[PDB]
Structures are given as C-alpha cells and as structure tokens.
From Swiss-Prot, chains A, B, C:
Name listed for the protein in its UniProt record: Capsid protein p24
Gene name of this polypeptide: gag
Result of altering N57D: Reduces binding to human NUP153. Does not affect binding to CPSF6. Reduces infectivity to non-dividing cells. Retains infectivity to dividing cells
Region (Interaction with human PPIA/CYPA and NUP153): 57-95
Annotated consequence of substituting N74A: Loss of binding to NUP153 and CPSF6
Shown chain mapped onto the complete sequence: 133 to 363 of 500
PPIA/CYPA-binding loop: annotated span: 85-93
Post-translational modification remark: Phosphorylated possibly by host MAPK1; this phosphorylation is necessary for Pin1-mediated virion uncoating.
Modified residues (Phosphoserine): S16
Subcellular location: Virion
TM regions (residue ranges): none
Signal peptide, first to last residue: none
C-alpha cells in the first residue's frame, strides 16, 4: 500500500508475503472467530483499495462469505453513488475526477487513478471508506455463523461461573446492537439463565454490581446465599 | 507506535505481524502465566494507546478477563479525570487542547489526534499511563485465575519439598503484596506448611541461614526426606 | 389554582368538592394501581403548592407511601437548591425575592406571597417542578407496589393468549424503563414467555411482524393458538 | 406484629397511629426510627437490623417488600 | 471460635494472645483483616462476610452487638 512521507512523498508498494502467510494461517486456524476483525484493521496501513481486494480474493474455504461480503460492498457502493453528494456532469482539465460508487473498488478503477485521488491534491478517504464497508460486512458475517443465540447461553449443575461468562463473551460480538442498551440487557440476562444454586449466590451479590465486583465474588468459594431464614 | 530517531523525527508505524503472531501464540500456551507481564512490557516499545487497544481486542480465549481489564482502564481514566489534571476546558486557538481522562484511551480520541500532541509538543505520557493501566489489569487478571491461597498450600504426606516449593513460588508471584512482608513471612511459612519428614530435615539447619544455604543442604538430602531418629 | 385571562387579570379560585371526592374515591378503590398516575395527572389542574399539598395530605389508607413520597419531594428539592441555580439573597428593594428549595414546600411559604412571586413579575416554575418531583415519588411507589416482574409472566398450558398478553401489558405498566431500552427488550419476551405450542405459531410467523400484525394472527388462531382442528 | 402477620399490616397500623401522635417533629423522628425495629415480630424484625444504621424509609421498604411476611407463601387450592 | 462460643469471648483470647507476640504496628493490623474472617465460627461468620471490606472496629462491633452470642439465632419459631 502507500508508504513513506518524512523521507519524501509517498510510494505505493507491494503487499507483504509475511502478512499474506499470516492472513492464510489465521483463517485456517480460526476463520469465523471475531479476533480477525481488529487484526484486519491493524495491518491495513495506507489502505489502498486495490491491495485490500487481494486479501478478499485470496481466501480458500469460506469463499461464500467473501462473495456475500462483495455483494454487501456493492450495496454500500450504490448508496455512495446516490445518497451522498456525488458529482453531477463535466469535470475540468487536470482534475482527478471525483469517484463514483463503482470507482471506489478495483473492478472499474485504474491504479494510478485510485492513487491520484488519494494524494494528488486534497486526499479522498477512499481506503477508509472501502475498509469501513469491509468491517461492516464482517460484523454481519459473525452473526450469520454464530451457533448460540443470547438466550441459548446457559449454565448446568456442574458448570462453574468461568465457562458461563466465557460463552457470553464469545457470543457478545454477534449481538450487534446499541452499546448503552446492550449493557442494560447484559445484567438482566446473567441472573436469568444461571443454575438455581448459582442464581441464589448471584442474587446475594444483588443489584448495582460491576464486572470486577462480580468477578471478585466469582473468585471465592461461594459466599452466603441464605435459604429458609423465615421458615 | 511512534518510532525512528537516527534517520530523523519519529513516525507512527503499525504493530509487527511477527509480534502479533508471537502475542497470540504465547497466549495460546501461557494464557495466565506471570512472564506475560514482562513480555507485554517488552512488546510495547514506542507506546501508543491506539495500537495498544488492538492488542487487547485480538485476544482469543480470555475475552472475559480482558473486559475486566478494560473496565479497570475506564475506572483509572475516571480517577484521572477527577483526582489528576482535569484540565480547564476552554482554550485559545493555536493550542492542541490536551488529553482529557477519557481521551487517554482510544475510545473518545482519534488516531492522528494522539500522534499530533505527542509530536508537536514535548512527550505526552499517554502511552506510558495506558501501559501502566494494562499492567495493573494483568496483575488483577492473574489474581482472578488463582487456585490456592497462602494457607491452602500445605505439603502432601509422600510429596517432596521440590514440588511444593515449585507451587509456592508460582503462587507467590500472583499474590501482589509488599516485598518486606513476603521476605519476613517466608521464614515461618515454609516451616509451618512442611510435612513431618521435610520439617524434621528443614529444622536441622536451624536459625539465621539464607535461601542458598538452606537449598544447598536440601539438595544433598534430596527426596521426600529420609526416615527419622527413632527406628 | 390561579385562573382567568379572557375576562382580565388572573385570580385564585377554589377546587370543586366533586374533584376532591373523585380523588378520595380513587384512593379508596385503587390506591396502588398504575392507573393512578395518569388519573392524578388528569385531575391535578394548575400547580400552586398549597392546593397540591391538600391532595397529598387527604390520603387515608397508604400513609407510609405518602410519607416516602413526601421525603422524595424533599430529596429532589435539596438537589434543586444546590445542583440547579442556587441564586443569591441580596437584591435591590422592590423585588419579590427568588424562592429557594425549602421555600417551595407548603409548610414553608405563605399563600399570599407564594402566588405573588409566581405571577406579579414574569413566572417562576415553582409549581411545575413540584408536580415533576411528585412523579418521581410515584415511580418509587410503583416499585414498592410491584407484585410480579416482566420475566415472571409466563403463559401456562391452559392459559389463553389474550390472558397472557393482558398480563404482559399489565406488568409492562410497572416496567419502569427508558424508551430506547424497552423498544429493544419487549421484542424477545413475546415468544420467550409463550407456551411451547404457542411458540410454534410465533416462530412460523417470524421477524417482521409489528404489534397490529401479531395481534391479527393471534385473533385468527383462537384461544392459546391450540393444535386441534383449527387449520 | 402478630406471629403470622405480614409486614404490611403491621406498618399500616404503625403509620395509622402515627397520624394522631401530636408531638414535636424532631423528637418524633428519633422515636419513629426505634419503633420499627421494636414492635416487629422476631422472624420479620431481622431484616430491619440487617440494613443497619442510617437507612431511609425507602431503603427499609425495599427489603421489607422482598421479605413479605412470616413462614412460607401459599399454594393454589 | 467454636459454635458454642460468643464473639466477646473469641475477641478476649485474641487480644490476650496478641500482646505477647511483640510485633510491628502494620503487620498486626494487616493480619487482623484476614484473621477475624478466617477463624470465626460458620454461623457467626456470615454476619462478618455480609458487612465485608471497609469500615472500622466500632462499626463492626456495633453490627456484632446487635446479633449477640455465637452468631446467635434470634428467631425462636
């Protein structure tokens, strides 16, 4: 992708073979797992759209998800060609020619044209826009392959608090809902699917708990839960 | 992270994939082991909160523990926003307006914004402070995974001192207590938690003696202690 | 209450004995009912503190709830005095003097001066805030009243859908939540708390059905949505 | 409070009686705090003491509403 | 503390023992925090656990004073 500045104006270089080995390895070990999403954001420096497409094009096994992601990207591209302040008719000499929806992606764009609007005059955030569409599509994929729904996460008689909490955190990324609402929901749900034995001690911790306080309580041997006081 | 000196002014680069692969692989094996805390201290060169945020997000197995660390960062940021430099608020043009307690973490602060104040003005400790918070969180995480407390570890009947000492020092590394208390406690704690065969040999060396002197004698006697003085 | 405009300057006028009897009748038959809050809101014309205080003081049966509500007014008044515009005592001669939080109370300010500072010079919302604080006390009374929770309303085998949804709407009167939160929470409950055979119909109907659409289907399947010759 | 009497009937009588008390308010407030623990039945009294010193009527009510009354709560038919 | 042993009797033996130890002010305090929680009788211990971290000795003693005996059962029926 694009690199260098302090040592002189940016050059658009070839993608790393080491990063390609890592991308293939990460997919082979954990294809549908959430940690791929921040990893993709981390190594996508310079974010040239043409290079970003190569990561999507080189996928083996779960190619169907990548094709669905491409259909989703094309839907987002269509919005950029309508809803947003897209250019009307003629364009003057020397100009980079303000991107259309399909010009964002490599299928109908030439590499020098793409680099041209990324740094010839004021930069267009095409790499960030294309990358954002990919993250939005990846968020749709993790809830398309999720085995357990939020109500499916439960704790049987012999299960400890550790596993019960871990499965909620694993399924958390597939929830895709408003954060303030999600927080409010999460505290109700923990009490709800707990084992009767566990529910009594968890209700003994009572209202107004934080994750750290809950984890602190969960680290013990099981403090007082109280049965039969009025009996 | 911000790196470069001999070739000129520092540049904000991205995390190494070799380091990311190593960080994932070490956590796959040594998930809660104490040496992770020095490794994280060594993997945070040129410390930048934006890059550090990603390292916590790419975690596999212990996402639940990581959310408690994230909550700890929110509490420390809140403490920073209240009991440390709050900041005036309104400020004249030609200034970078400084980081608020929330802005130390990449949640309310954007990429270039953090780099700008660390580069345009003398070093801002935001990376150092965020790193210190992560180390505090990791210390709390090992505590929340601990299995045996100080009086829970008592030597077995046929167990030798070797295996007991191995467990004791590993347990001690996760305690998070004063060095004076730890040194002073060790002298009576080993004698009081030892089995009868071990304790008989252990008291033979007697008062004053340092760990090297005791260990040298113990290595010679070996095993789970040889039989006493009445048979 | 103070009334009149079309005939000229405003005047203080007495409440109807029928209005007082209507309130007393509501207290006798439905004291803790959630329908009391809009009924009280409908009957509480104007907002002058002395006449508002009469409504609270004429209650019979639930004296403790009224005492707790009265304490809640004091709690809000204290917050209003010190966390909202406190203002300051010295002001030039010929003013009506801006009320403090303790002056809002019926036991503190006299009727002649109380109406006098509420309309001689541009209005002060002294009554408006008192009515607002009464609603907070009523929200607390709904919590004390609460006999069943939203998760506790579960359809039996021989319990009709109409009885179940009527019970669900009744416990929703006491839900006490934000507009954003309840619009997300309510959606899952309808199939979650429905009986197994009733769930089959709801599952078949699927996501995309609003309340009018869902009610139309339920009206069409009869009773709890049974499985005997209704197809 | 009776041996099989719920908290609600007991607090209702206490507050009904309180209306006709006729004494200085600050003096009453001290007495009123003590009376709640004093006249409660052994089984229901425990929760008032459990919340300890400096609790409000609202804080007490929340615990009291959860407890309800003596023994076990009835069955259908 | 045994199940038939009240809190004052348990406290008395601890202080008598503590005077003979001859130790630094921080260490005695820092051991006192965990010792009371660890060696209290099971019935009595719950009251201490319910109070939990924080406060001072008079506040803890005030809570204990109200329940009496060896974590005594105030309830009789």
């Amino acid at each position: 992708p694009i690199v260098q500045n302090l040592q002189g104006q940016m050059v658009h270089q070839a993608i790393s073979p080491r990063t390609l080995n890592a991308w293939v390895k990460v997919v082979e070990e954990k294809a549908f797992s959430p940690e791929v999403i921040p990893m993709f954001s981390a190594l996508s420096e310079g974010a040239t759209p043409q290079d970003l497409n190569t990561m999507l094009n080189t996928v083996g096994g779960h190619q169907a998800a990548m094709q669905m992601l491409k259909e989703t990207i094309n839907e987002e591209a269509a919005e950029w060609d309508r809803l947003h302040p897209v250019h009307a008719g003629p364009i003057a000499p020397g100009q980079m020619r303000e991107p259309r929806g399909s010009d964002i992606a490599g299928t109908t764009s030439t590499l020098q044209e793409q680099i041209g609007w990324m740094t010839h005059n004021p930069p267009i955030p095409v790499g960030e826009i294309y990358k954002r569409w990919i993250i939005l599509g990846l968020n749709k994929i993790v809830r398309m392959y999720s085995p357990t729904s939020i109500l499916d996460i439960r704790q049987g008689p012999k299960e400890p608090f550790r596993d019960y909490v871990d499965r909620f955190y694993k399924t958390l990324r597939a929830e895709q809902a408003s954060q303030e609402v999600k927080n409010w929901m999460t505290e109700t749900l923990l009490v709800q699917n707990a084992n009767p034995d566990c529910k009594t001690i968890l209700k003994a911790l009572g209202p107004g708990a934080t994750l750290e306080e809950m984890m602190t309580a969960c680290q013990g041997v099981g403090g007082p839960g109280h049965k039969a006081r009025v009996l």
